[PDB]
Design a protein around this ligand. Sequence first.
Ligand SMILES: CC/C(=C(\c1ccc(O)cc1)c1ccc(OCCN(C)C)cc1)c1ccccc1
Ligand SMILES: CC/C(=C(\c1ccc(O)cc1)c1ccc(OCCN(C)C)cc1)c1ccccc1
Ligand SMILES: C[C@H](CCC(=O)O)[C@H]1CC[C@H]2[C@@H]3[C@H](O)C[C@@H]4C[C@H](O)CC[C@]4(C)[C@H]3C[C@H](O)[C@]12C
Ligand SMILES: C[C@H](CCC(=O)O)[C@H]1CC[C@H]2[C@@H]3[C@H](O)C[C@@H]4C[C@H](O)CC[C@]4(C)[C@H]3C[C@H](O)[C@]12C
Lengths: 216, 224
Amino acid sequence: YNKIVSHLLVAEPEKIYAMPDPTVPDSDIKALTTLCDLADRELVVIIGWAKHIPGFSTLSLADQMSLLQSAWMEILILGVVYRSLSFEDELVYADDYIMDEDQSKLAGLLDLNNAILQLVKKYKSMKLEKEEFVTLKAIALANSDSMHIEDVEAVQKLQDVLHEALQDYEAGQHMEDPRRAGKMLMTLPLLRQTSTKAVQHFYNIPMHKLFLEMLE
Amino acid sequence: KPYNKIVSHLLVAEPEKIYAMPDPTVPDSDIKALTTLCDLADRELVVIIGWAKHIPGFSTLSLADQMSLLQSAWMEILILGVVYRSLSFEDELVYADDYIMDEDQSKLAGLLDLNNAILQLVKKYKSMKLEKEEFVTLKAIALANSDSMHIEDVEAVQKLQDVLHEALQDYEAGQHMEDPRRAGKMLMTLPLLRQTSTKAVQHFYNIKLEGVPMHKLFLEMLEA
Ligand SMILES: CC/C(=C(\c1ccc(O)cc1)c1ccc(OCCN(C)C)cc1)c1ccccc1
Ligand SMILES: CC/C(=C(\c1ccc(O)cc1)c1ccc(OCCN(C)C)cc1)c1ccccc1
Ligand SMILES: C[C@H](CCC(=O)O)[C@H]1CC[C@H]2[C@@H]3[C@H](O)C[C@@H]4C[C@H](O)CC[C@]4(C)[C@H]3C[C@H](O)[C@]12C
Ligand SMILES: C[C@H](CCC(=O)O)[C@H]1CC[C@H]2[C@@H]3[C@H](O)C[C@@H]4C[C@H](O)CC[C@]4(C)[C@H]3C[C@H](O)[C@]12C
């Protein structure tokens, strides 16, 4: 077994919940607010998780932040994609918040959710395992291509270590396909692309009580 | 060991130089630079379409899928081209032998942010010492792995990806045994290529929005 990959499994964060309020009228506003709150709570956990990635803490705090700033959305997206592998045309943002097509339209996330579903499809066909998922996650962070990195060589070494862990895992656990590690790496471009779409949509995406009182 | 068939075909199919040929009668300006790049791009894209037909297995996909792949990866192929041509240079982008943009030229063209992002790609490939054989293979892989949402025959496209991926892996095993993970490191550069290309396409349309390209037939229609 690969020590780094096994270590990554154990450092995997605990499940987080959306906890949507059932007495609140279902709406785009509710959905988006639920997702935003869920994301922020997942991110606090992600920041702590990173510190357990072998080598991450040896980087400067400036570089640690740069990597996290460049890859935070890719980590969130990869999480949802993974939790959705055993579902059909649905996204498990959380055990207590699974979105189907109709819910996506109502939240104005049809396009974006379908892109995320594109990722789920590829991973389904490859039968992505938990070991591969957590290693790819760490790789996405290490390979986030921030332009503000101070020690390029230290980040490259970080990438090389996680990359070796993945090929080592793939070499022993999947001899039926000697190109499986490469196929995993080839899914990163779509992850980066979908992550970019999500971030772009987040910005693109009031106080009626007080407002009505100001007019009164 | 002798290069496998795929890499051999790609090296032979590699297009001859293409010049930007900016109009000498037109004074320098942001509009000129952008007009020049657009014209070069269009001629390169014509050459790229013919080049793809020479990629083993591409002409076997339906014409709809051939189109989808090309419509998804055209900018990545063009960007990988400029990046490769700029490897032996420093802080300058070689769009063509007759069109090299340094920083001050980029600022004048309004392309500083985009060109700086393209130079980021150059920097990575320079440290890896990207070779021509790896370059032609990556262009082909970028085309097959473009991730279009309009693919009809997913398995056919997946097979094309595997054949090209194998060509790279085999090339690296025989040519760079000293680094058992060199093929993987090449593949890991694709995300930045996708990111920079998306950034370029978006900047292009923001340009045509606040205006862009000096249309030839335009003034003729008005003078007529
Ligand atoms: C796809 C759902 C989503 C987010 C999400 C994705 C995966 C996941 O596990 C949890 C949430 C999402 C929404 C908001 C968000 O904010 C981060 C910034 N904070 C500091 C305000 C992040 C992700 C989203 C992204 C762009 C526009 C609208 C919604
Ligand atoms: C970076 C230079 C560039 C182009 C380019 C890149 C690589 C290369 O080898 C040659 C040019 C560029 C400009 C226009 C363009 O148009 C394609 C669409 N046609 C059909 C109008 C493509 C690339 C560009 C891209 C977006 C905005 C401004 C300029
Ligand atoms: C949610 C949390 C604060 C929790 C709290 O109220 O105590 C804050 C503190 C640090 C924040 C993060 C940092 O500002 C770094 C990143 C900045 C990006 O623009 C968004 C994600 C990003 C990763 C942030 C997510 C988030 O809003 C964080 C994680
Ligand atoms: C330049 C050439 C025609 C030039 C001419 O002889 O007049 C045209 C004809 C078909 C065009 C292509 C097709 O419309 C398909 C693609 C559409 C994308 O938006 C740009 C690239 C794209 C790949 C196009 C590049 C280009 O503008 C093409 C290749």
